[PDB]
Amino acid sequence: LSHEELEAALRDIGARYHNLHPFHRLLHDGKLSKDQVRAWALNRYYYQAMIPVKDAALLARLPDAQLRRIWRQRIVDHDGGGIERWLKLAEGVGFTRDYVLSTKGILSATRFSVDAYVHFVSERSLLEAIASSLTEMFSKNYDFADFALDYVKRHATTPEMQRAAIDALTFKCNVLWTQLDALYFAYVAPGMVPP
Amino acid sequence: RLLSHEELEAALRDIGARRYHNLHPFHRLLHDGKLSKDQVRAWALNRYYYQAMIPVKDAALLARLPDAQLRRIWRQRIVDHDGGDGGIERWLKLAEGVGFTRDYVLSTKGILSATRFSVDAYVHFVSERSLLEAIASSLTEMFSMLKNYDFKDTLADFALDYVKRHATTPEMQRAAIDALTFKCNVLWTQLDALYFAYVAPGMVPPDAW
């Protein structure tokens, strides 16, 4: 209920966050094939390629110029810049720039979980939309955010709002969690899926 | 790629020859009766969600329609599913009939995120794409049992017409062939999630009952 307990609860949900997912475990501890890392990169492009779609989706819902200016900074980071760093990693492990861009190869589950993220932000309430960035509280073995948290504290005024805040963060974690499930399903075990 | 028409029916049919959910490890396993009771439990729980959301889809779709004559045709699909007692209600029977409480199944607390998100994508697709695609995405219906699972009282042509007469540019024929692909993906990921979580191997935060 208070700002620090509210925060304590949001962090605890981190301690559900995607570094615990088995697809991260492997990756982080040097154990995935190169095709497996490529797949990862190919799919994770689409997640990155839509963060600015998401922040612009959210910007239009902001009620004053002051809040828009601030949020706009995140659009500026990715469109440039951020998306461009991501292309380079996937070019970095062998993909033509044009193949990554067109999304031909990405998995339907990624596409849905990411497009789920875009629509939450535009359908759910502003407090929830803002609360779902807060995974940003939580962010070399192959030869080959304080504004959001202030915001939710001052605007989650009631118990219900407060749980929406918490629910919204879990939604975020699920979005991310299920990208990874798909990628494990498709590419580490058992290993299936059409185009 | 040029124009088609009856060749177009055999392009649409042909997506179901491959991309339609009956050619899936989960659907093979269910059909042949090799899943445990719990695995028919997961499937049944998750599928409720797809079934509960088809009227939502068709409303969303009903709202984007340009006139009353069309809303009238399409309104039937809504009725089929909502009924006072109709299509969704059978599906709750199936869930009830493999041990679930009506209350848990209804709430969706325990569906997997991938189903939520695939089904939701279908809802948006129909709100966002052209009328021709929304309609085309119905066409798995051109492809619409369990005598290995001992567990009594628990035991379409308009669209295909619309698409041929309105798919007059090659760009529109692909869009509709994609629309049907898209939807094949929606069912396919539902099942990929189910396979991953309940058969080989996975688990998935709070979800599975």
PDB file of N, CA, C and O in Angstrom, chain A residues 45 48 77-91 97 101:
ATOM      1  N   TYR A  45      14.307  -9.545 -32.395  1.00  0.00           N
ATOM      2  CA  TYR A  45      14.218  -8.309 -33.248  1.00  0.00           C
ATOM      3  C   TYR A  45      12.847  -7.666 -33.129  1.00  0.00           C
ATOM      4  O   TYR A  45      12.748  -6.535 -32.710  1.00  0.00           O
ATOM      5  N   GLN A  48      11.905  -5.785 -30.102  1.00  0.00           N
ATOM      6  CA  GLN A  48      12.606  -4.523 -30.057  1.00  0.00           C
ATOM      7  C   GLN A  48      12.001  -3.599 -31.060  1.00  0.00           C
ATOM      8  O   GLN A  48      11.738  -2.437 -30.739  1.00  0.00           O
ATOM      9  N   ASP A  77      15.177   6.939 -28.058  1.00  0.00           N
ATOM     10  CA  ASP A  77      16.190   5.900 -27.874  1.00  0.00           C
ATOM     11  C   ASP A  77      16.124   4.755 -28.886  1.00  0.00           C
ATOM     12  O   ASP A  77      17.144   4.164 -29.188  1.00  0.00           O
ATOM     13  N   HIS A  78      14.942   4.363 -29.362  1.00  0.00           N
ATOM     14  CA  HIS A  78      14.848   3.095 -30.070  1.00  0.00           C
ATOM     15  C   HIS A  78      14.879   3.429 -31.582  1.00  0.00           C
ATOM     16  O   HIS A  78      15.735   2.905 -32.345  1.00  0.00           O
ATOM     17  N   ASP A  79      14.034   4.367 -32.017  1.00  0.00           N
ATOM     18  CA  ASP A  79      14.006   4.733 -33.436  1.00  0.00           C
ATOM     19  C   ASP A  79      15.245   5.462 -33.799  1.00  0.00           C
ATOM     20  O   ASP A  79      15.571   5.516 -34.963  1.00  0.00           O
ATOM     21  N   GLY A  80      15.880   6.094 -32.811  1.00  0.00           N
ATOM     22  CA  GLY A  80      17.228   6.656 -32.956  1.00  0.00           C
ATOM     23  C   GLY A  80      17.175   8.157 -32.931  1.00  0.00           C
ATOM     24  O   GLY A  80      16.368   8.695 -33.626  1.00  0.00           O
ATOM     25  N   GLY A  81      19.483   4.156 -33.882  1.00  0.00           N
ATOM     26  CA  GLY A  81      19.664   3.981 -32.442  1.00  0.00           C
ATOM     27  C   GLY A  81      19.352   2.575 -31.912  1.00  0.00           C
ATOM     28  O   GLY A  81      20.025   1.613 -32.308  1.00  0.00           O
ATOM     29  N   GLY A  82      18.353   2.419 -31.023  1.00  0.00           N
ATOM     30  CA  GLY A  82      18.106   1.129 -30.336  1.00  0.00           C
ATOM     31  C   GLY A  82      17.811  -0.041 -31.266  1.00  0.00           C
ATOM     32  O   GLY A  82      18.471  -1.095 -31.219  1.00  0.00           O
ATOM     33  N   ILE A  83      16.828   0.143 -32.132  1.00  0.00           N
ATOM     34  CA  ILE A  83      16.496  -0.882 -33.131  1.00  0.00           C
ATOM     35  C   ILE A  83      17.724  -1.237 -34.004  1.00  0.00           C
ATOM     36  O   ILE A  83      18.017  -2.423 -34.278  1.00  0.00           O
ATOM     37  N   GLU A  84      18.435  -0.184 -34.423  1.00  0.00           N
ATOM     38  CA  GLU A  84      19.704  -0.293 -35.196  1.00  0.00           C
ATOM     39  C   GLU A  84      20.817  -1.117 -34.477  1.00  0.00           C
ATOM     40  O   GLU A  84      21.334  -2.021 -35.102  1.00  0.00           O
ATOM     41  N   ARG A  85      21.124  -0.877 -33.185  1.00  0.00           N
ATOM     42  CA  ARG A  85      21.926  -1.843 -32.442  1.00  0.00           C
ATOM     43  C   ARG A  85      21.329  -3.262 -32.647  1.00  0.00           C
ATOM     44  O   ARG A  85      22.082  -4.160 -33.020  1.00  0.00           O
ATOM     45  N   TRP A  86      20.017  -3.484 -32.485  1.00  0.00           N
ATOM     46  CA  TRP A  86      19.543  -4.891 -32.553  1.00  0.00           C
ATOM     47  C   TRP A  86      19.782  -5.602 -33.904  1.00  0.00           C
ATOM     48  O   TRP A  86      20.166  -6.773 -33.914  1.00  0.00           O
ATOM     49  N   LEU A  87      19.540  -4.902 -35.011  1.00  0.00           N
ATOM     50  CA  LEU A  87      19.840  -5.403 -36.374  1.00  0.00           C
ATOM     51  C   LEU A  87      21.270  -5.899 -36.545  1.00  0.00           C
ATOM     52  O   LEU A  87      21.514  -6.893 -37.247  1.00  0.00           O
ATOM     53  N   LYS A  88      22.193  -5.170 -35.913  1.00  0.00           N
ATOM     54  CA  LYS A  88      23.636  -5.438 -35.996  1.00  0.00           C
ATOM     55  C   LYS A  88      24.032  -6.728 -35.305  1.00  0.00           C
ATOM     56  O   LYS A  88      24.827  -7.479 -35.850  1.00  0.00           O
ATOM     57  N   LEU A  89      23.481  -7.000 -34.128  1.00  0.00           N
ATOM     58  CA  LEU A  89      23.673  -8.307 -33.484  1.00  0.00           C
ATOM     59  C   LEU A  89      23.203  -9.489 -34.386  1.00  0.00           C
ATOM     60  O   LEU A  89      23.906 -10.505 -34.470  1.00  0.00           O
ATOM     61  N   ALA A  90      22.075  -9.337 -35.097  1.00  0.00           N
ATOM     62  CA  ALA A  90      21.506 -10.421 -35.943  1.00  0.00           C
ATOM     63  C   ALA A  90      22.221 -10.535 -37.286  1.00  0.00           C
ATOM     64  O   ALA A  90      22.414 -11.651 -37.823  1.00  0.00           O
ATOM     65  N   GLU A  91      22.592  -9.376 -37.836  1.00  0.00           N
ATOM     66  CA  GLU A  91      23.614  -9.331 -38.896  1.00  0.00           C
ATOM     67  C   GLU A  91      24.925  -9.939 -38.347  1.00  0.00           C
ATOM     68  O   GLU A  91      25.552 -10.772 -38.996  1.00  0.00           O
ATOM     69  N   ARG A  97      20.347  -8.232 -43.327  1.00  0.00           N
ATOM     70  CA  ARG A  97      19.466  -7.140 -42.816  1.00  0.00           C
ATOM     71  C   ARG A  97      18.008  -7.166 -43.307  1.00  0.00           C
ATOM     72  O   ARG A  97      17.099  -6.845 -42.553  1.00  0.00           O
ATOM     73  N   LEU A 101      14.324  -7.868 -40.997  1.00  0.00           N
ATOM     74  CA  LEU A 101      13.370  -6.791 -41.105  1.00  0.00           C
ATOM     75  C   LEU A 101      11.958  -7.245 -41.459  1.00  0.00           C
ATOM     76  O   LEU A 101      10.982  -6.638 -41.001  1.00  0.00           O
TER      77      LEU A 101
END
